[PDB]
Design an enzyme around this catalytic site. Sequence first.
Site, PDB file in Angstrom:
ATOM      1  N   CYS A  19       0.834  -1.206   0.000  1.00  0.00           N
ATOM      2  CA  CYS A  19       0.000   0.000   0.000  1.00  0.00           C
ATOM      3  C   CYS A  19       0.877   1.267   0.000  1.00  0.00           C
ATOM      4  O   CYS A  19       1.724   1.429  -0.877  1.00  0.00           O
ATOM      5  CB  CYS A  19      -0.947  -0.027   1.206  1.00  0.00           C
ATOM      6  SG  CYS A  19      -2.296   1.197   1.148  1.00  0.00           S
ATOM      7  N   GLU A  51      -1.810  -8.309   4.563  1.00  0.00           N
ATOM      8  CA  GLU A  51      -1.908  -8.644   5.981  1.00  0.00           C
ATOM      9  C   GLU A  51      -3.323  -8.580   6.549  1.00  0.00           C
ATOM     10  O   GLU A  51      -3.614  -9.182   7.585  1.00  0.00           O
ATOM     11  CB  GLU A  51      -0.983  -7.731   6.793  1.00  0.00           C
ATOM     12  CG  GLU A  51      -1.554  -6.354   7.089  1.00  0.00           C
ATOM     13  CD  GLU A  51      -1.667  -5.448   5.865  1.00  0.00           C
ATOM     14  OE1 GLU A  51      -1.406  -5.902   4.724  1.00  0.00           O
ATOM     15  OE2 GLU A  51      -2.026  -4.261   6.062  1.00  0.00           O
ATOM     16  N   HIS A  75      -3.655  -4.805   0.527  1.00  0.00           N
ATOM     17  CA  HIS A  75      -3.238  -5.116   1.898  1.00  0.00           C
ATOM     18  C   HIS A  75      -3.239  -6.622   2.114  1.00  0.00           C
ATOM     19  O   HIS A  75      -4.278  -7.212   2.432  1.00  0.00           O
ATOM     20  CB  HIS A  75      -4.191  -4.486   2.918  1.00  0.00           C
ATOM     21  CG  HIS A  75      -4.055  -3.002   3.044  1.00  0.00           C
ATOM     22  ND1 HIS A  75      -3.105  -2.407   3.847  1.00  0.00           N
ATOM     23  CD2 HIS A  75      -4.743  -1.990   2.463  1.00  0.00           C
ATOM     24  CE1 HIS A  75      -3.214  -1.092   3.757  1.00  0.00           C
ATOM     25  NE2 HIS A  75      -4.201  -0.812   2.922  1.00  0.00           N
TER      26      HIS A  75
END
EC number: 4.3.3.6
Length: 196
Positions: free
Chosen positions: A79, A172, A170
């Site tokens: 990001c 994660e 993203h």
Amino acid sequence: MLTIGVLGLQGAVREHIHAIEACGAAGLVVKRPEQLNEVDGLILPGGESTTMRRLIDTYQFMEPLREFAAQGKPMFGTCAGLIILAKEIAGSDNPHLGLLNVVVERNSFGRQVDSFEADLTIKGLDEPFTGVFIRAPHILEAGENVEVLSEHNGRIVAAKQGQFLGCSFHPELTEDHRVTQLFVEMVEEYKQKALV
């Protein structure tokens, strides 16, 4: 074992660290330049482009991040992290590390329509990967030396270049840690070549 770091100057780090551990490896919230000597690789979390920029400066982080890069240590920009790691448009304001040979544009969508999910086909992963896009930056162009690891609607969303790895989504923010695993494999490959 390996030890992946996560630049914690800004944004959230909690989930990247869980991901790194899940893949069997130590995770350290890098908050000070010197800590970079303590890790085998670094993850630039991102979040807010402009913010993280002024933060790394008042914290004398830029030069060290370049020395980190020169040591061949792997860096993963996710990001906003992608922005720091890459290059900005033609005559953009003031660039960042510019190590990943790709040109990036900051999100332009409003707060109400800036998020969405999409199943992705990532080179190295077999089954599709769900990418969480939130104010995602857009890769406008990539050099002849970066390998495209994934694309969505014609746009490059995950790219790789030697020790560098970038993605506009993203990874994660999901329970699926396969992308983090790609970076962890990159760091081990680095451990198996670094004379120390």
